[PDB]
Amino acid sequence: INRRMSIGEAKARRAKKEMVEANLRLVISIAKKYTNRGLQFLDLIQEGNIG
DNA sequence: ATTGAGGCTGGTCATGGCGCTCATAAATCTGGTATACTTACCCACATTGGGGCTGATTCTG
């Protein structure tokens, strides 16, 4: 049971990582429009990645 | 140098606005979820150090 659920968790983590790497572009595109509101572009894109 | 009274040393009785403590409560402060589709920003000097030559002593075919 332990290693089966470990394999399942690893598969889920891989799929989620793939989704995040695919949608990084959308994150950047959304974060483009808040670059002049007292926050850095890198901070904005990191918050977008978290979201 | 005594004994007859005033001024002044001991404690009575609460008294009274102040401060710490309890409790109520609406305003203030935090966390949370939204499903038509949106995918790569915007000057002049002096000195030391790194990298590319430049021979110049060692070895070679």
Closest CA to A24 of A8, A46, A41, A3: A46
Token pair 């659920």 is at which residue?
A: A5
- In three-state secondary structure terms, A38 is coil
Strand B atom within 7 Å of A41 CB: yes
Provide the CA A37 to C1' B4 distance, Å, integer.
101
Say which amino acid occupies A24. Answer: L
Give Cα separations from A11 to A7, A8, A18, A49 (angstroms): 6, 5, 11, 20
Tokens 């995040």, residue located:
A20
A44 neighbors A34 (Cβ within 8 angstroms): yes
Six-digit token string for A50: 């978290």
Return the half-sphere exposure (C-beta side, CA atoms, 13 A cut-off) of residue A46.
5
Task: Report which residue is nearest nucleotide B40 when distances run from CA to C1'.
Answer: A25
Q: Which nucleotide is nearest to A28 (CA to C1')?
A: B39
User: What is the structure's resolution, reported in angstroms to one decimal?
Assistant: 2.8
Distance separating alpha carbons of residues A31 and A40, to the nearest angstrom: 10
Instruction: Kindly provide the residue ranges of all beta strands, DSSP E only, lying in A1-51, ordered along the sequence.
Output: none
* Ramachandran quadrant class, A38 (left: phi over 0; alpha: psi -120 to 50; beta: rest): left
